[PDB]
Symmetry: C3
Subunit: 140 residues, 3 copies
């Protein structure tokens, strides 16, 4: 098991811009503050999105397009280093009433989004290709 | 994009009272401690609830009543200032097995609820009417 | 209402081992570090899992087995003391696309899992049998 230790100090609440990508805005914020490791959470609504699941056998993602407004029922994830820059790994649950979709988040157009960011001060984990899963998991 | 910066220090785990409203109990706690900004998370189960989704075009909420015991599969949100008092904005996923419902949380009767409250020390965001969404979003 | 106060300081991001139980790995980590109270969060995917819901009348859990790879759409919980050792209480949402399952988490074989652990420094809550719900809730 890989263990990454950190200290917490700052906290951020963000109001994302309407009509822009959710993931892209967070990453822009991260770059601006120089945050390389963090825990992410959010709620709100999106105008559309692109999610997907990971085929654990073929070792590839399978995405789904959703071109309908949905509530961000749940949004959670983390920040780490990939290709020399802060990289967001986020999972979500979008929908309304009994209509629920979930998976790895690729993109989402924001309607109204409030994001909580908890930066983690310490060695930022780096994502490297992992043979076993076919994903880019933390190494050191 | 609006950015609100804070420092973290305290942490709270609460055991809510059976038969009382989930949102109301948290709000009472916040008033007592004078918490104006925070991140919220909870798990447990409820005896009933009122959730809803936001029609992004008509600009109004559409609620759903659930008068059946449900598990709190996911509860996340934040605290901010609205009408000069701590205001909770929470989204949830309630249900059992494959029966899942989700949305903006209005009310929930508690069965057993464990809440994690992470107060945020800094300028609390205030909610003001936003023309674009018809929602009450953070101004400053 | 019961209130447990804490101070936050450290933060941990863990990369769980493939093919091992999710809950057990976190618990081994908590024991090694001596964490008696904390907030938990995670995302990733599992190869199989066992969840369930609580019948609030009969006062007993009803389990559900899932022997199919699933994405961890949402994983949230807390750590506390039970039987004199760190005990995890976790709720999850597993699935893909519109196939979503949710409930109290009993076990899950890890495919790839990134866990965020926020230890809470203070008097750790202890779980004791509660007549009203039939669950083991926090006392003091
Ligand atoms: Zn993922
Ligand atoms: Zn909402
Ligand atoms: Zn539970």
């Amino acid at each position: 098991m890989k263990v990454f230790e950190f200290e917490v100090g700052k906290g951020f609440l963000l109001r994302l811009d309407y009509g822009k990508d959710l993931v892209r805005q967070i990453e822009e914020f991260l770059e601006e503050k120089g945050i390389h490791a963090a825990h992410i959470s959010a709620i709100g609504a999106v105008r559309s999105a692109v999610i997907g699941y990971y085929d654990q056998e073929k070792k590839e993602y399978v995405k789904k397009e959703l071109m309908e407004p949905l509530e961000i029922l749940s949004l959670s994830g983390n920040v780490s280093m990939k290709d020399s820059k802060p990289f967001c790994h986020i999972h979500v649950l979008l929908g309304k009433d009994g209509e629920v979709y979930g998976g790895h988040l690729f993109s989402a157009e924001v309607f109204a989004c409030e994001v909580f960011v908890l930066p983690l001060s310490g060695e930022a984990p780096e994502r490297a290709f992992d043979e076993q899963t076919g994903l880019f998991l933390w190494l050191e």
